[PDB]
Design a protein around this ligand. Structure first.
Ligand SMILES: Cc1cc(NCc2c(Cl)ccc(Cl)c2Cl)c2cc(F)cc(C(N)=O)c2n1
Ligand SMILES: *[C@H]1O[C@H](COP(=O)(O)O)[C@@H](O)[C@H]1O
Length: 239
């Protein structure tokens, strides 16, 4: 008998991949040059192997968190929601700005799936828990929750956030941003959350869910700002 989850399994070559990503990142970001990637992988693995893939906690990821400590300039943070492809394109241009995935820990896991199983050191390449159908506390979900929190707490000055203007929910309170990030911005260091709405011809800052974002933020004594981005590709140049 082998247990079958609703979600897709661990990505093939996942151990080999994460390790290789760590080696590459260290090579190209000179300040990380002396990070031990085998120790980093071992701490990643350590967080989820031999554990039921539904009893994962944030503490499990702390050994890895500590190894992948990176405090980027907090005034240079770019958050995003659902519209990740464009946000990375952006930081591949501006290049002083940072999304989570341009940090080591996020770079290591972006687009990847992993999970283990109780009591053995094996990795499940056949399936992993679905956040909806099976478990909210899986290894992937707990990973992003944990780093999303630390990332957003770090932030300062003006934090900019990208949102998708073709979605029915421009701001989703149940997304990683609406659920974890927004609530961890510190009023001490963050003055403004500036929202960018990307039109994938009318003013989408008026939107109800944007107005709802304005409420969450306003109640943290942080100022809110919203700008339409009519022609997206034109923004990429005019930066
Ligand atoms: C696969 C994945 C999942 C991410 N977060 C899931 C999620 C949602 Cl949608 C809502 C609430 C919570 Cl607490 C959680 Cl954990 C996720 C989040 C990111 F910020 C980034 C990625 C990514 N780059 O792959 C991500 N991926
Ligand atoms: C933290 O979470 C957002 C992306 O998650 P969504 O579920 O909101 O797309 C990203 O900006 C990270 O900084």
């Amino acid at each position: 008998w082998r247990q079958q989850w609703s979600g897709p399994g661990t990505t093939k070559r996942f151990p080999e991949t994460v390790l290789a990503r760590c080696v590459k990142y260290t090579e190209i970001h000179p300040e990380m040059r002396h990070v031990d990637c085998q120790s980093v992988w071992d701490a990643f693995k350590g967080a989820f192997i031999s554990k039921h893939p539904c009893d994962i906690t944030e503490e499990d990821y702390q050994p890895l968190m500590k190894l992948g400590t990176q405090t980027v300039p907090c005034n240079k943070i770019l958050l995003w929601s659902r519209i990740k492809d464009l946000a990375h394109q952006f930081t591949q241009v501006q290049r002083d700005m940072f999304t989570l995935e341009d940090t080591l820990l996020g770079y290591l896991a972006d687009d990847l799936t992993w999970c283990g199983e109780f009591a053995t050191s094996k990795i499940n390449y056949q399936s992993c828990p679905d956040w909806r159908k099976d478990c909210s506390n899986n290894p992937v979900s707990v990973f992003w929750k944990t780093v999303s929190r630390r990332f957003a707490e770090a932030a300062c000055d003006v934090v900019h956030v990208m949102l998708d203007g073709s979605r029915s929910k421009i701001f989703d309170k149940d997304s990683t941003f609406g659920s974890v990030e927004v609530h961890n911005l510190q009023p001490e260091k963050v003055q403004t959350l500036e929202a960018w709405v990307i039109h994938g011809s009318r003013d989408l800052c008026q939107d109800p869910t944007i107005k709802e974002l304005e409420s969450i933020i306003s109640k943290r004594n942080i100022q809110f700002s919203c700008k339409n981005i009519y022609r997206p590709d034109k923004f990429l140049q005019c930066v």
